[PDB]
Amino acid sequence: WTATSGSCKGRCFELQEVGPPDCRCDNLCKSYSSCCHDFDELCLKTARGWECTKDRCGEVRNEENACHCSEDCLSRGDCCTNYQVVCKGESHWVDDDCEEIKVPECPAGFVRPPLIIFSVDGFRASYMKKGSKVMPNIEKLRSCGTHAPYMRPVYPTKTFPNLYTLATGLYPESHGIVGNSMYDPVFDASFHLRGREKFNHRWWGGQPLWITATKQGVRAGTFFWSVSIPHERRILTILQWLSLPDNERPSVYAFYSEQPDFSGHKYGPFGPEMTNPLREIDKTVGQLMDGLKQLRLHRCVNVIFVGDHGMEDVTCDRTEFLSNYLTNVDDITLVPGTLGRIRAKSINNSKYDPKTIIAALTCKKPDQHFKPYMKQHLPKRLHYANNRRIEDIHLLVDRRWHVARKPLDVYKKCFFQGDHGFDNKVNSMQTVFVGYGPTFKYRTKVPPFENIELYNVMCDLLGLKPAPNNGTHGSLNHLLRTNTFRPTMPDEVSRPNYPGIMYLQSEFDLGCTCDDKVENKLEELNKRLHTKGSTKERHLLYGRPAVLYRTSYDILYHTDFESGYSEIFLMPLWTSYTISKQAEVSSIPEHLTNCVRPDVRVSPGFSQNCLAYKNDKQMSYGFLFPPYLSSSPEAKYDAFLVTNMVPMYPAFKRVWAYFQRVLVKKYASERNGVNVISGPIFDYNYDGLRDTEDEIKQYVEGSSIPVPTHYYSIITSCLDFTQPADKCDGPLSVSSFILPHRPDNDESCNSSEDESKWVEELMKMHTARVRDIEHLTGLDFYRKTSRSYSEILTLKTYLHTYESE
Ligand SMILES: *[C@@H]1O[C@H](CO)[C@@H](O[C@@H]2O[C@H](CO)[C@@H](O[C@@H]3O[C@H](CO[C@H]4O[C@H](CO)[C@@H](O)[C@H](O[C@H]5O[C@H](CO)[C@@H](O)[C@H](O)[C@@H]5O[C@H]5O[C@H](CO)[C@@H](O)[C@H](O)[C@@H]5O)[C@@H]4O)[C@@H](O)[C@H](O[C@H]4O[C@H](CO)[C@@H](O)[C@H](O)[C@@H]4O[C@H]4O[C@H](CO)[C@@H](O)[C@H](O)[C@@H]4O)[C@@H]3O)[C@H](O)[C@H]2NC(C)=O)[C@H](O)[C@H]1NC(C)=O
Ligand SMILES: Cn1c(=O)n(Cc2ccc(F)c(F)c2)c2cnc(Nc3ccc(C(=O)N4CCC(S(N)(=O)=O)CC4)cc3)nc21
Ligand SMILES: [Ca+2]
Ligand SMILES: [Cl-]
Ligand SMILES: [K+]
Ligand code: NA
Ligand SMILES: [Zn+2]
């Protein structure tokens, strides 16, 4: 109940919301059906439109008008945004030359440059080039300020998850808004685009920027506008708030536009009908900039122009139906469209079985346009598993397609021509970022980055300490002229042991054999030097990784590779080696096929054993440094040390052996040498964070050898590929992956073919940032380079996406 009999007189777009049953006058009151009876009359004036005309100049103030052109309008703060242009001979902001803003030029009483976030729905990255002729205000922000060629959204590429990630710096699995539609089984409640459940604060986790600001004494405008409030009124309201007295005036504001998304769904991303919505949003930007210029704030405020996601061509006929796969289609509930989420229709149905659903949906039709996954098996880069609102069964839908439960759902729920929501590496889903103002750089292009990084920068722009989030603070320092955040590298928690030769061969009873009984003082000193680290500068190019948790581990040096060997998990945490452009690939010699050799530096008690592998009929093993890339026949023996062995399913060994035998040398050829760091990851609770030992669900049978859930590799070279990886003077280039360690290749529909037809495609799907691997391992990489720490933070957030231009 609301007592709508109260009045909005002197309260229009009040900043503090009042509690029921008192009636409201704030920018969300319409959404709650709770505005005072006179809100439209007082707060949503429209008389005479949004623009001054010559005949209105110096008019007697009429309080009924939408905006004013009377002499007192600047002091009242309520002129139409074109007032000074029409009535005072001034230029529109867009017509002015750009001039570098070296320092804030702010009116007296301003304690900091305000921040205005201008967010646009469905603004695909390529609109900046393709719509350039019709968006002169946005093009001026872009060219004069700091811009990226695109910004990567989070998955799913829908509005609610992305706007709330922009506001929090958190992945959707952590902030809790994991779709536009959700069921929470603990609450037994459903969140939808339509209706009141979505207003309950229990869905919304993390700490969004407006709360961060308020808690730290920085006042905020309200960031939500009821959809029926026209954009012109939203802009005027922002400009009116910016005329409040200092102690009442917010320092951070947000505008959101439902366009161009609304028209893109109707017309497709590049429908001819899309020019007008792009022109209209540009005109709104121009209203804001003209208004700021009026207030003498156009060289004071930082403006961020940012999208939530892009838009792809999607039509009703490109729909896959689960009724063409499942015999049992009425026993499931599907969240449908550009992703699928499946759960049981009834929790009382004890016949429901996820394994049989997944099997029925796996590689059943030759050009199948979706792929099923249990959520823990999705690419780790999507960070889309650790939330009870994310169903265990997920369908990743191909770009341009939908999935639905039955055909009738498509015509009893063609209309639309555009949609979005697909994997966030898809080109059409990319969106936009421009920052303009005194704190951003001038005429600067920055590389693409992820929207999770922006919260920390918005906090930097406002002098706020960010709440804990998934950005890497400092990775976007290169966007900023000032207010940079200068982090220190984390301190190493565990220092390595450096074992020498401590055990005789007969102390080991591992059930291993090797044909290595072969025959020299010239070479003898050389072998000793290699084991004490003489080649370590060649193979450990950026310092040893730091271990940021408490554990026991040993550094082991070899001619061709260096490793950090865990005494707790019985295998390397990391193995580092460099492969030059000139390196040769060799075979594993016939007589060494099953060779595994005790490591006389590491106790039998802290070693794996071959008998466990023999007995475990499902599990085999592989090596982290590949025997194929040994520098000589003699050095190859080191590759078969028990301290270089890791548990591998046979199906996974197909993938791993092709990576090691074919792809590493391909990359060294293309990149002019590569440095490779590889290792295991354990994430049995799919939280994106390193497991402790007591979280491990699977061991090699009869042993305490834990089975990794994934294997990673970080592949680094010189950005200037005229310099070899091991003699690089300048910035680096990296690509990384986190491959799921699975007992089958059901993910790869073409896996019965030769590895040359499917393995690199799998690897591309499971591309990763170095930072993802850091979270999953508790390791910190790139400790000792010639590069600035912020540059290295940027490198650790890079994702190699494998999309065309
Ligand atoms: C991305 O960045 C984020 C933010 O930094 C990282 O997430 C943090 O990760 C931490 C570790 O996973 C986690 O720390 C835990 O916090 C517990 C207290 O949590 C509450 O309070 C905070 C602070 O205000 C709040 O933010 C939390 O918000 C979560 O939950 C609410 C409602 O339930 C949601 O609205 C909200 O969206 C958010 O949910 C997300 O996180 C939770 C986990 O907290 C997930 O379950 C959700 O799916 C969703 O992802 C909470 O309101 C604290 O109690 C924990 O301590 C336990 O473990 C330690 C082990 O050392 C032990 O000492 C304690 O005793 C305790 O264990 C006991 O409880 C166990 C569980 O029942 C039990 O099994 C044991 O036997 C013990 O009795 C822990 O410190 C932190 O909460 C989140 N924060 C957020 C915002 O998500 C995230 O990791 C980053 N991601 C990557 C990939 O890097
Ligand atoms: C979820 N969230 C936030 O975290 N903030 C705050 C914020 C966060 C970051 C910013 F950067 C910013 F500035 C503000 C928001 C501010 N406004 C809105 N308004 C919406 C959202 C969706 C729909 C809708 O129902 N749909 C999207 C539009 C389509 S359309 N185009 O088909 O109408 C229909 C579905 C209608 C209105 N949502 C917000
Ligand atoms: Ca984990
Ligand atoms: Cl959704
Ligand atoms: K075996
Ligand atoms: Na397969
Ligand atoms: Zn949309």
XYZ file of all heavy atoms in Angstrom, residues 28 116-122 158-168 177 180 191-194 198 204 208 210 222-227 234 253-265 304 306-309 311 420 458, ligand 2:
528
model
N 12.775 6.231 -9.474
C 12.227 4.885 -9.580
C 10.791 4.725 -9.124
O 10.230 3.621 -9.180
C 13.070 3.889 -8.784
C 14.183 3.256 -9.556
C 14.764 2.146 -8.672
C 13.733 2.675 -10.895
N 30.395 11.108 -14.516
C 29.089 10.768 -15.121
C 29.274 9.506 -15.974
O 30.103 9.501 -16.913
C 28.531 11.904 -16.004
C 28.246 13.100 -15.060
C 27.193 11.485 -16.580
C 27.781 14.340 -15.824
N 28.500 8.448 -15.644
C 28.591 7.197 -16.443
C 27.402 7.246 -17.399
O 26.249 7.369 -16.945
C 28.479 5.981 -15.489
C 29.606 6.025 -14.472
C 28.475 4.685 -16.303
C 29.202 5.347 -13.164
N 27.652 7.097 -18.704
C 26.589 7.164 -19.692
C 26.567 5.778 -20.320
O 27.466 5.458 -21.124
C 26.937 8.250 -20.741
C 25.807 8.585 -21.695
C 25.158 9.830 -21.625
C 25.408 7.701 -22.700
C 24.160 10.134 -22.532
C 24.362 8.002 -23.593
C 23.752 9.233 -23.516
N 25.602 4.940 -19.913
C 25.589 3.548 -20.377
C 24.537 3.321 -21.433
O 23.460 3.957 -21.423
C 25.427 2.551 -19.224
O 24.179 2.743 -18.572
N 24.928 2.508 -22.422
C 24.023 2.254 -23.578
C 23.808 0.770 -23.770
O 24.757 -0.020 -23.755
C 24.583 2.879 -24.848
C 24.279 4.383 -24.898
C 26.109 2.632 -24.920
N 22.570 0.340 -23.923
C 22.220 -1.086 -24.066
C 22.410 -1.563 -25.503
O 21.957 -0.905 -26.438
C 20.731 -1.235 -23.715
C 20.344 -2.643 -23.326
O 21.163 -3.362 -22.739
O 19.211 -3.045 -23.623
N 23.067 -2.701 -25.674
C 23.219 -3.313 -26.987
C 24.068 -2.515 -27.980
O 23.941 -2.692 -29.196
N 24.041 -10.465 -21.422
C 22.691 -9.920 -21.247
C 22.788 -8.658 -20.365
O 23.815 -8.464 -19.666
C 21.823 -10.976 -20.538
C 21.651 -12.325 -21.251
C 20.666 -12.178 -22.351
C 20.204 -13.571 -22.814
N 19.276 -13.300 -23.948
N 21.725 -7.847 -20.322
C 21.750 -6.560 -19.633
C 21.989 -6.608 -18.138
O 22.901 -5.924 -17.623
C 20.428 -5.805 -19.926
O 20.379 -5.680 -21.350
C 20.463 -4.464 -19.246
N 21.180 -7.371 -17.403
C 21.238 -7.329 -15.936
C 22.638 -7.819 -15.441
O 23.225 -7.159 -14.620
C 20.096 -8.120 -15.285
C 18.815 -7.292 -15.083
C 18.153 -6.725 -16.161
C 18.323 -7.088 -13.821
C 16.973 -5.984 -15.963
C 17.169 -6.342 -13.613
C 16.501 -5.789 -14.691
N 23.162 -8.959 -15.949
C 24.471 -9.371 -15.466
C 25.516 -8.352 -15.810
O 26.412 -8.117 -14.956
C 24.716 -10.673 -16.202
C 23.312 -11.259 -16.413
C 22.518 -10.011 -16.792
N 25.489 -7.778 -17.011
C 26.558 -6.843 -17.359
C 26.495 -5.477 -16.669
O 27.545 -4.930 -16.310
C 26.657 -6.715 -18.879
C 27.505 -7.837 -19.440
O 28.725 -7.698 -19.424
N 26.885 -8.960 -19.847
N 25.301 -4.876 -16.590
C 25.254 -3.603 -15.851
C 25.672 -3.795 -14.405
O 26.407 -2.978 -13.867
C 23.820 -3.001 -15.923
C 23.357 -2.506 -17.293
C 21.923 -1.967 -17.123
C 24.271 -1.395 -17.869
N 25.283 -4.907 -13.757
C 25.622 -5.072 -12.383
C 27.104 -5.456 -12.225
O 27.738 -5.007 -11.257
C 24.677 -6.040 -11.660
C 24.648 -5.824 -10.196
C 24.309 -4.567 -9.650
C 24.894 -6.888 -9.320
C 24.319 -4.358 -8.241
C 24.912 -6.701 -7.938
C 24.600 -5.445 -7.411
O 24.637 -5.303 -6.036
N 27.694 -6.142 -13.210
C 29.159 -6.338 -13.185
C 29.873 -4.972 -13.349
O 30.858 -4.709 -12.636
C 29.582 -7.296 -14.305
O 29.275 -8.637 -13.900
C 31.136 -7.183 -14.648
N 29.379 -4.096 -14.239
C 30.017 -2.781 -14.393
C 30.023 -2.088 -13.009
O 30.997 -1.468 -12.624
C 29.297 -1.909 -15.443
C 29.632 -2.315 -16.884
C 28.604 -1.707 -17.856
C 31.025 -1.780 -17.229
N 28.913 -2.194 -12.283
C 28.755 -1.451 -11.027
C 29.514 -2.061 -9.846
O 29.710 -1.356 -8.828
C 27.293 -1.457 -10.655
N 29.942 -3.325 -9.951
C 30.497 -4.065 -8.785
C 31.925 -4.536 -8.985
O 32.606 -4.924 -7.978
C 29.648 -5.291 -8.375
O 29.592 -6.189 -9.488
C 28.270 -4.862 -7.899
N 23.687 -11.942 -9.983
C 22.739 -11.730 -11.067
C 23.286 -12.502 -12.290
O 24.032 -11.965 -13.153
C 22.544 -10.203 -11.326
C 22.204 -9.454 -10.010
C 21.533 -9.954 -12.456
C 20.873 -9.919 -9.380
N 19.113 -12.794 -16.844
C 17.934 -11.922 -16.761
C 16.762 -12.677 -16.108
O 15.845 -12.032 -15.608
C 17.548 -11.548 -18.185
C 18.418 -10.456 -18.781
O 19.208 -9.761 -18.107
N 18.210 -10.233 -20.064
N 13.406 -14.808 -10.211
C 13.692 -13.424 -10.608
C 13.375 -13.354 -12.085
O 13.785 -14.209 -12.887
C 15.185 -13.234 -10.331
C 15.785 -11.887 -10.731
C 16.200 -11.016 -9.721
C 16.029 -11.551 -12.065
C 16.879 -9.840 -10.006
C 16.713 -10.336 -12.359
C 17.068 -9.483 -11.338
N 12.587 -12.340 -12.461
C 12.266 -12.110 -13.888
C 12.388 -10.625 -14.303
O 12.257 -9.752 -13.462
C 10.786 -12.462 -14.153
C 10.415 -13.858 -13.783
N 10.849 -14.955 -14.498
C 9.624 -14.335 -12.791
C 10.364 -16.054 -13.945
N 9.622 -15.703 -12.907
N 12.581 -10.384 -15.603
C 12.562 -9.023 -16.150
C 11.301 -8.269 -15.741
O 11.376 -7.115 -15.354
C 12.684 -9.055 -17.668
C 14.092 -9.425 -18.173
C 14.071 -9.702 -19.693
C 15.127 -8.367 -17.785
N 10.152 -8.938 -15.820
C 8.865 -8.349 -15.413
C 8.524 -8.691 -13.964
O 8.727 -9.830 -13.540
C 7.737 -8.874 -16.320
C 7.740 -8.312 -17.733
C 7.329 -6.845 -17.738
N 7.907 -6.118 -18.865
C 8.297 -4.847 -18.820
N 8.185 -4.151 -17.694
N 8.807 -4.270 -19.903
N 12.415 -9.088 -8.583
C 13.723 -8.484 -8.912
C 14.073 -7.260 -8.058
O 15.226 -6.910 -8.004
C 13.804 -8.159 -10.425
C 12.874 -7.016 -10.877
C 13.246 -6.521 -12.267
C 12.432 -5.263 -12.574
N 11.006 -5.604 -12.821
N 20.826 -9.188 -5.014
C 21.894 -8.318 -5.481
C 23.061 -8.313 -4.532
O 23.030 -7.616 -3.496
C 21.338 -6.906 -5.659
C 20.168 -6.873 -6.573
C 18.849 -7.120 -6.236
C 20.164 -6.520 -7.949
N 18.036 -6.934 -7.319
C 18.816 -6.555 -8.393
C 21.171 -6.118 -8.863
C 18.452 -6.318 -9.707
C 20.813 -5.843 -10.172
C 19.431 -5.924 -10.601
N 27.848 -2.390 -4.943
C 27.907 -1.552 -6.170
C 28.429 -0.151 -5.884
O 28.441 0.319 -4.705
C 26.420 -1.509 -6.591
C 25.656 -1.670 -5.290
C 26.470 -2.641 -4.444
N 27.509 2.937 -6.206
C 26.764 3.957 -5.441
C 26.820 3.684 -3.944
O 26.784 4.652 -3.136
C 25.319 4.107 -5.958
C 24.509 2.852 -5.947
C 23.720 2.357 -4.935
C 24.461 1.869 -7.009
N 23.142 1.155 -5.327
C 23.575 0.841 -6.601
C 25.038 1.819 -8.294
C 23.287 -0.274 -7.412
C 24.725 0.709 -9.130
C 23.856 -0.299 -8.688
N 20.968 8.727 -8.072
C 20.401 7.364 -8.122
C 20.680 6.791 -9.540
O 20.561 7.531 -10.504
C 18.915 7.373 -7.678
O 18.166 8.246 -8.509
C 18.809 8.000 -6.290
N 21.124 5.533 -9.652
C 21.659 4.987 -10.945
C 20.607 4.329 -11.857
O 20.929 3.852 -12.986
C 22.759 3.926 -10.655
C 24.161 4.467 -10.421
C 24.410 5.596 -9.634
C 25.236 3.778 -10.982
C 25.752 6.014 -9.406
C 26.534 4.194 -10.777
C 26.778 5.299 -9.977
N 19.372 4.286 -11.385
C 18.249 3.615 -12.103
C 17.199 4.651 -12.482
O 16.874 5.469 -11.641
C 17.591 2.517 -11.239
C 18.526 1.387 -10.873
C 19.438 1.582 -9.817
C 18.457 0.141 -11.482
C 20.335 0.579 -9.434
C 19.342 -0.897 -11.090
C 20.274 -0.664 -10.053
N 16.627 4.574 -13.687
C 15.570 5.507 -14.116
C 14.386 4.658 -14.562
O 14.539 3.781 -15.393
C 16.006 6.316 -15.315
C 17.261 7.134 -15.011
C 18.575 6.707 -15.071
C 17.296 8.474 -14.478
N 19.427 7.758 -14.673
C 18.658 8.829 -14.282
C 16.298 9.453 -14.217
C 19.048 10.096 -13.782
C 16.668 10.669 -13.731
C 18.024 11.011 -13.509
N 13.189 4.942 -14.084
C 12.022 4.172 -14.597
C 11.974 4.344 -16.127
O 12.231 5.432 -16.683
C 10.756 4.741 -13.982
O 10.778 4.415 -12.618
N 11.656 3.242 -16.827
C 11.804 3.202 -18.288
C 10.974 4.275 -18.996
O 11.377 4.788 -20.052
C 11.473 1.788 -18.852
C 10.042 1.401 -18.533
C 11.719 1.703 -20.354
N 15.867 12.650 -18.083
C 16.957 12.066 -17.330
C 18.162 13.030 -17.369
O 18.789 13.278 -16.307
C 17.327 10.708 -17.914
C 16.184 9.689 -17.793
C 16.593 8.348 -18.401
N 15.387 7.575 -18.766
C 15.396 6.288 -19.130
N 16.536 5.566 -19.151
N 14.227 5.686 -19.487
N 27.205 10.087 -10.980
C 25.911 10.041 -11.621
C 25.917 8.962 -12.676
O 26.988 8.635 -13.242
C 25.680 11.363 -12.396
C 25.703 12.574 -11.498
C 26.904 13.221 -11.195
C 24.504 13.070 -11.025
C 26.916 14.332 -10.346
C 24.491 14.195 -10.194
C 25.693 14.808 -9.901
O 25.697 15.916 -9.049
N 24.723 8.454 -12.984
C 24.580 7.483 -14.100
C 23.355 7.735 -14.938
O 22.287 8.077 -14.405
C 24.606 6.031 -13.617
N 23.545 7.525 -16.244
C 22.450 7.558 -17.220
C 22.478 6.211 -17.906
O 23.525 5.620 -18.055
C 22.737 8.635 -18.233
C 21.825 8.596 -19.434
C 20.604 9.274 -19.464
C 22.214 7.846 -20.561
C 19.761 9.198 -20.585
C 21.357 7.751 -21.654
C 20.146 8.419 -21.670
N 21.302 5.694 -18.223
C 21.204 4.425 -18.960
C 20.222 4.622 -20.067
O 19.190 5.290 -19.902
C 20.772 3.276 -18.032
C 20.340 2.008 -18.755
C 21.254 1.177 -19.349
C 18.996 1.692 -18.828
C 20.847 0.025 -20.021
C 18.567 0.550 -19.498
C 19.501 -0.272 -20.069
O 18.985 -1.391 -20.699
N 20.577 4.101 -21.230
C 19.621 4.099 -22.374
C 19.323 2.672 -22.829
O 20.227 1.847 -23.006
C 20.244 4.834 -23.533
O 19.652 4.495 -24.823
N 18.044 2.411 -23.024
C 17.569 1.120 -23.511
C 17.826 0.937 -24.996
O 17.587 -0.181 -25.501
C 16.052 1.054 -23.258
C 15.598 1.252 -21.787
C 15.490 2.748 -21.309
O 15.666 3.702 -22.123
O 15.261 2.932 -20.067
N 18.223 1.996 -25.681
C 18.624 1.957 -27.083
C 20.155 1.961 -27.181
O 20.866 2.490 -26.315
C 18.045 3.201 -27.791
C 16.547 3.093 -28.093
C 16.232 2.181 -29.322
O 16.856 1.153 -29.552
N 15.258 2.590 -30.123
N 20.703 1.431 -28.252
C 20.051 0.935 -29.470
C 19.544 -0.519 -29.372
O 19.050 -1.055 -30.382
C 21.173 1.094 -30.504
C 22.444 0.798 -29.728
C 22.162 1.544 -28.404
N 19.702 -1.188 -28.207
C 19.291 -2.577 -28.048
C 17.839 -2.798 -28.518
O 17.576 -3.787 -29.211
C 19.386 -2.960 -26.556
C 19.032 -4.376 -26.295
O 19.943 -5.196 -26.493
O 17.921 -4.716 -25.834
N 16.913 -1.915 -28.129
C 15.485 -2.160 -28.390
C 15.244 -2.302 -29.904
O 14.638 -3.273 -30.344
C 14.677 -1.010 -27.826
C 13.206 -1.144 -28.054
C 12.470 -2.093 -27.339
C 12.561 -0.300 -28.949
C 11.089 -2.211 -27.520
C 11.175 -0.421 -29.145
C 10.458 -1.372 -28.422
N 15.800 -1.391 -30.670
C 15.656 -1.466 -32.122
C 16.504 -2.615 -32.695
O 16.093 -3.274 -33.652
C 16.089 -0.137 -32.745
O 15.121 0.884 -32.418
N 17.695 -2.878 -32.125
C 18.538 -4.010 -32.651
C 17.827 -5.365 -32.552
O 17.998 -6.227 -33.442
N 17.016 -5.594 -31.513
C 16.264 -6.841 -31.458
C 15.278 -6.912 -32.646
O 15.075 -8.016 -33.188
C 15.461 -7.012 -30.166
C 16.310 -7.393 -28.990
N 16.860 -8.652 -28.868
C 16.752 -6.669 -27.931
C 17.583 -8.692 -27.756
N 17.523 -7.506 -27.174
N 32.169 8.694 -18.733
C 32.488 7.380 -19.284
C 31.308 7.046 -20.171
O 30.142 7.121 -19.755
C 32.627 6.333 -18.156
C 33.981 6.535 -17.443
C 32.522 4.891 -18.705
C 34.100 5.700 -16.201
N 29.856 3.866 -22.058
C 30.128 2.428 -21.932
C 28.870 1.633 -22.296
O 27.759 2.074 -22.019
C 30.597 2.128 -20.492
C 29.563 2.463 -19.402
C 31.191 0.725 -20.394
N 29.068 0.498 -22.972
C 27.967 -0.384 -23.284
C 27.927 -1.607 -22.365
O 28.935 -1.942 -21.679
N 26.814 -2.328 -22.408
C 26.709 -3.567 -21.656
C 27.062 -4.816 -22.479
O 27.629 -5.764 -21.906
C 25.344 -3.696 -20.965
C 24.167 -3.506 -21.911
O 24.354 -3.388 -23.143
O 23.047 -3.507 -21.339
N 26.726 -4.835 -23.783
C 26.940 -6.025 -24.647
C 26.643 -5.579 -26.050
O 26.028 -4.512 -26.249
C 26.021 -7.220 -24.272
C 24.584 -6.842 -24.171
N 23.842 -6.506 -25.289
C 23.765 -6.638 -23.096
C 22.619 -6.131 -24.903
N 22.556 -6.202 -23.582
N 25.297 -7.124 -30.147
C 24.013 -7.592 -30.758
C 24.418 -8.381 -31.997
O 25.278 -7.924 -32.773
C 23.185 -6.369 -31.199
C 21.813 -6.707 -31.839
S 20.668 -7.449 -30.657
C 20.268 -6.067 -29.577
N 21.338 -11.330 -28.243
C 22.660 -11.356 -27.635
C 22.507 -12.287 -26.418
O 21.405 -12.703 -26.030
C 23.057 -9.916 -27.197
C 22.024 -9.248 -26.380
N 21.935 -9.416 -25.005
C 20.925 -8.541 -26.748
C 20.859 -8.780 -24.560
N 20.232 -8.216 -25.588
N 36.609 3.493 -11.682
C 35.592 4.435 -11.221
C 35.865 4.790 -9.787
O 35.756 5.976 -9.386
C 34.216 3.826 -11.425
C 33.988 3.732 -12.935
S 32.317 3.318 -13.376
C 32.228 1.697 -12.616
C 20.714 -3.758 -13.653
N 21.030 -2.349 -13.562
C 22.044 -1.829 -12.890
O 22.976 -2.473 -12.178
N 21.931 -0.514 -13.065
C 22.789 0.472 -12.450
C 23.860 0.894 -13.430
C 25.022 -0.041 -13.556
C 26.033 0.248 -14.439
C 25.916 1.467 -15.245
F 26.914 1.730 -16.109
C 24.862 2.319 -15.117
F 24.903 3.462 -15.869
C 23.788 2.031 -14.128
C 20.845 -0.154 -13.917
C 20.298 1.175 -14.406
N 19.150 0.970 -15.228
C 18.689 -0.338 -15.426
N 17.550 -0.291 -16.248
C 16.971 -1.371 -16.979
C 17.640 -2.512 -17.134
C 16.970 -3.597 -17.967
C 15.744 -3.372 -18.471
C 15.090 -4.503 -19.246
O 14.026 -4.984 -18.842
N 15.724 -4.933 -20.405
C 16.896 -4.326 -20.934
C 16.295 -3.432 -22.068
C 15.591 -4.376 -23.041
S 14.943 -3.481 -24.473
N 16.231 -2.641 -25.135
O 14.395 -4.582 -25.329
O 14.046 -2.495 -23.932
C 14.462 -5.167 -22.333
C 15.115 -5.979 -21.168
C 14.967 -2.111 -18.246
C 15.596 -1.121 -17.532
N 19.162 -1.491 -15.006
C 20.225 -1.422 -14.261
